[PDB]
Antibody, heavy 222, light 213 residues
Framework: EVQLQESGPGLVKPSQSLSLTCTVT?????????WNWIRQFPGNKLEWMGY???????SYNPSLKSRISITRDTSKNQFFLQLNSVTTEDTATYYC??????????????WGQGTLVTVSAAKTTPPSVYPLAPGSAAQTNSMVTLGCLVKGYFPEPVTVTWNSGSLSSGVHTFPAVLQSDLYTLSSSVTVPSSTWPSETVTCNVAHPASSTKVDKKIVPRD | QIVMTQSPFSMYATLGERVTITCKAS??????LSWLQQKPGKSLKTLIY???RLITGVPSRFSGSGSGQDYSLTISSLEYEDMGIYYC?????????FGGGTKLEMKRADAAPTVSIFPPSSEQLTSGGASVVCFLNNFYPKDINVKWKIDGSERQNGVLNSWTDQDSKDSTYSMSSTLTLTKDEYERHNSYTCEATHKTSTSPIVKSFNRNE
């Protein structure tokens, strides 16, 4: 049964048009249902933007009436969002979804995974990645804690993993902070003293907007 | 437009406990109401449709009731993996509208932070910048204070802080504090200290390094 996948650019300039595509598989967008776009702003508020029905009929949130267009290509089983004249307030995570057109039979709303779109005039920039190893005068415990500082990138997001995802527990990544049109975050991993540096520990940093992947080995300070 | 108001805005509940949250609509919405869940860092997921119809794959402990303008969601036997934000959406009239969200966090035994300080890497120093990072990991409750001292002197500006959401395994919080200076200012001082004050101790947790060791 049905699957929905949002795709499109992660960064749009103010005053340009934001475009996204939802690729639907397992169900034909012409048979039934309404094919929807919603969004979630930073701060978590949610908004329904509109839909195109299985019949080709649109319904648009009145708050967006001038700027939005939802179209479809029935031969590709896709539907599309266009939002014109964006400003920075259009920065949000955009979801596609399916809802019931008719009241009966009763249908459950079903949402895609969401894709972040930043509206900004700032330039795409890849992160610099720095190791966080303890001062060589620092104390070995039972557990040691290391990390990676991911600095000076734009826009969001970045994903960081450790030893390619093998190290999962004892791991957490802090939300990024924005300064001067650039983001910084770090990530922490905690493993047994007995296993580092004998076992090697590497943070893997991926920044999709710049198509960048970097791996940094954490080496003890001497 | 139909206004959807959720209450409470925020809450804490014990593991195993029965939790209820409410959604109120500005006018009758004929039970065309859905409940969505968003676990921290993750995507929106629909749990309930038409007020009380559970989505397949959703556990029995979740249940929706209400009619007219007044709707509720109930978790029985709260579990760790139920933390996150819950939203109520009306699909009765255009435009479809959502509630502002109720955040559900897990109550647990207090925990002191595990504090780590890290000096700048030589890679970063080669570029003229110097960030000193401190992790305050796996503490509860969420409220905490961190103080930086450079050669003993408290530093306020140049410092950026960031908190995680509750960890989904141990329900603890974590925070990181980063002091960014120029290479030149960094190398004008010997001692860098990160101090964590938490209700778990009258005395703060002090971590430190000196450039001359």
């Amino acid at each position: 049964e049905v699957q929905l996948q949002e795709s499109g650019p992660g960064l749009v300039k103010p005053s340009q048009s934001l475009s996204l595509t939802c690729t639907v598989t397992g169900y034909s967008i012409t048979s039934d249902y309404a094919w929807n776009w919603i969004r979630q702003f930073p701060g978590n508020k949610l908004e329904w933007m509109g839909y195109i029905s299985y019949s080709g009929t649109t319904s648009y949130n009145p708050s967006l009436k001038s700027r939005i267009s939802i179209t479809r290509d029935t031969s590709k089983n896709q539907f599309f969002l266009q939002l014109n004249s964006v400003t920075t307030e259009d920065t949000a995570t955009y979801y596609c979804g399916r809802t019931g057109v008719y009241r009966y039979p009763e249908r459950a709303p079903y949402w895609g995974q969401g894709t972040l779109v930043t509206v900004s005039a700032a330039k795409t920039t890849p992160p610099s990645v720095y190791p966080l190893a303890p001062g060589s005068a620092a104390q070995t415990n039972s557990m040691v804690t290391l990390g990676c500082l991911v600095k000076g990138y734009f826009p969001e997001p970045v994903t960081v993993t450790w030893n390619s995802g093998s190290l999962s527990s004892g791991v957490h990544t802090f939300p990024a902070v924005l300064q001067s049109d650039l983001y910084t975050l770090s990530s922490s991993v905690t493993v047994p003293s007995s296993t580092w540096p004998s076992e090697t520990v590497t943070c893997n940093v991926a920044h999709p907007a710049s198509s960048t992947k970097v791996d940094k080995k954490i080496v003890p300070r001497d | 437009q139909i206004v959807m108001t959720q209450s409470p805005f925020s809450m804490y509940a014990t593991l195993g406990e029965r939790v209820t949250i409410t959604c109120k609509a500005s006018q009758d919405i004929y039970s065309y109401l859905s409940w969505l869940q968003q676990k921290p860092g993750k995507s929106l997921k629909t749990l309930i449709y038409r007020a009380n119809r559970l989505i397949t794959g959703v556990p029995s402990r979740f249940s929706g009731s209400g009619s007219g303008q007044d709707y509720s969601l109930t978790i029985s036997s709260l579990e760790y993996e139920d933390m996150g934000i819950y939203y109520c959406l009306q699909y009765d009239e255009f435009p479809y509208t959502f509630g502002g969200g109720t955040k559900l966090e897990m109550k647990r035994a207090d925990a002191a932070p595990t504090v780590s300080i890290f000096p700048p890497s030589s890679e970063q120093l080669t570029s003229g910048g110097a960030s000193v990072v401190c992790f305050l990991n796996n503490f509860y409750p969420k409220d905490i204070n961190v103080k930086w001292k450079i050669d003993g002197s408290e530093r306020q500006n140049g410092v950026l802080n960031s908190w995680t959401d509750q960890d989904s395994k141990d329900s603890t919080y974590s925070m990181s504090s980063t002091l960014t200076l120029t290479k030149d200012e960094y190398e004008r001082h010997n001692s860098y200290t990160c101090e964590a004050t938490h209700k778990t101790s009258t005395s703060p947790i002090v971590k430190s390094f000196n450039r001359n060791e």
